[PDB]
């Protein structure tokens with residue numbers, strides 16, 4: 001039986017609440033997507049189906065756009081790819097926005113597929129559109145996405161008879177804007193976008209009591225605090241390394257609400273996040289636009305070079321608790337790990353540990369994963385007591401955020417055993 005239920009909230013639409021008392025780490029729901037796609041940066045880098053990276057991917061011969069890890073993935077993907085394949089082929093060399101490829105897959109799934117377990121608690125039909133809150137600038141954007149979909153899909157979808165009953169493309173894209181999930185790989189790299197309509201019942205908090213984690217396209221929802229019967233379940237929609245001003249902007253622009261948690265009234269953590277010289281951090285925040293774009297496209301050498309120019313600047317430097325500096329350290333660590341510069345990775349990674357302790361309170365999967373990365377780098381280098389410390393800590397966090405149902409926890413258990421054996425010997 002379910003441990004969660006849909007309910008009507010007082011002022012934030014529908015939500016999800018606990019039916020039984022919940023403890024940290026408890027699995028509350030699990031879902032495959034209604035629909036998902038690889039994201040722009042990762043296309044041709046990770047398998048379309050399993051979202052795992054490979055050195056060499058095999059392309060779909062018909063469209064040459066979909067790429068796969070294996071014959072098993074290409075074949076398994078074919079039913080959900082076959083209609084988009086003709087559209088992707090037709091519009092070559094144009095490639096659509098991710099939202100447009102996503103909605104195409106939504107439409108084909110709803111037209112051709114059996115009712116989806118992803119819609120058990122709540123359906124695409126039910127999703128919030130916020131249409132009475134959209135600004136004229138947003139409505140113009142949505143109009144353009146509708147016309148882009150009509151162009152991209154024209155080989156497969158010519159009229160309304162090929163859309164679900166009463167389906168309105170403008171409304172559908174408004175639902176995609178505020179109900180898209182970013183799918184992250186095991187290393188917390190963004191690799192895809194998906195719709196998970198049951199999980200879309202969860203409302204936002206800047207200090208949430210649940211968390212989601214991805215294992216390929218599969219989503220696990222877990223409690224990360226004690227929760228009482230009847231208590232609303234929340235997740236944080238946003239990256240933790242954001243000031244209240246930045247959260248306000250994104251919650252308005254993407255989700256059309258004003259968040260009234262304690263952290264937002266009190267600007268909790270903002271001052272410590274913005275320590276250091278403001279001219280310098282403004283420059284680094286600007287440089288991060290490019291660094292994050294490069295990272296999104298897995299360009300690790302260009303990422304490292306830009307990060308080193310900041311971390312080791314001749315000019316004024318920032319404290320590592322400054323969130324822009326911190327994001328630069330984290331990109332530099334990940335670029336080093338991917339490039340096999342393991343000593344340099346560990347330097348950057350260890351610098352992030354105290355700031356991550358501060359900015360990811362409680363049990364947050366991003367901190368779990370960071371601590372595991374650092375442990376693994378220390379294990380490699382023969383630093384056993386320190387690795388063991390960090391691997392235990394990663395486990396204390398990831399037992400709650402990831403759980404036994406997540407494959408990374410098995411990987412971590414193997415590092416723990418290896419490290420323990422080394423210490424014992």
Ligand SMILES: C[S@@+](CC[C@H](N)C(=O)[O-])C[C@H]1O[C@@H](n2cnc3c(N)ncnc32)[C@H](O)[C@@H]1O
Nearest residue numbers: 012013014128178200201202203204255256257
């Ligand atoms: C993923 S949906 C969450 C479920 C939604 N309340 C519903 O009725 O379908 C996100 C939308 O929920 C509302 N929302 C989520 N968190 C909220 C919050 N903390 N305060 C006010 N509205 C919130 C906003 O309308 C937002 O665009």
Ligand SMILES: [Zn+2]
Nearest residue numbers: 047050069073
């Ligand atoms: Zn695959």
Ligand SMILES: [Zn+2]
Nearest residue numbers: 060062063085
């Ligand atoms: Zn194809």
Ligand SMILES: [Zn+2]
Nearest residue numbers: 206259261264
């Ligand atoms: Zn808030």
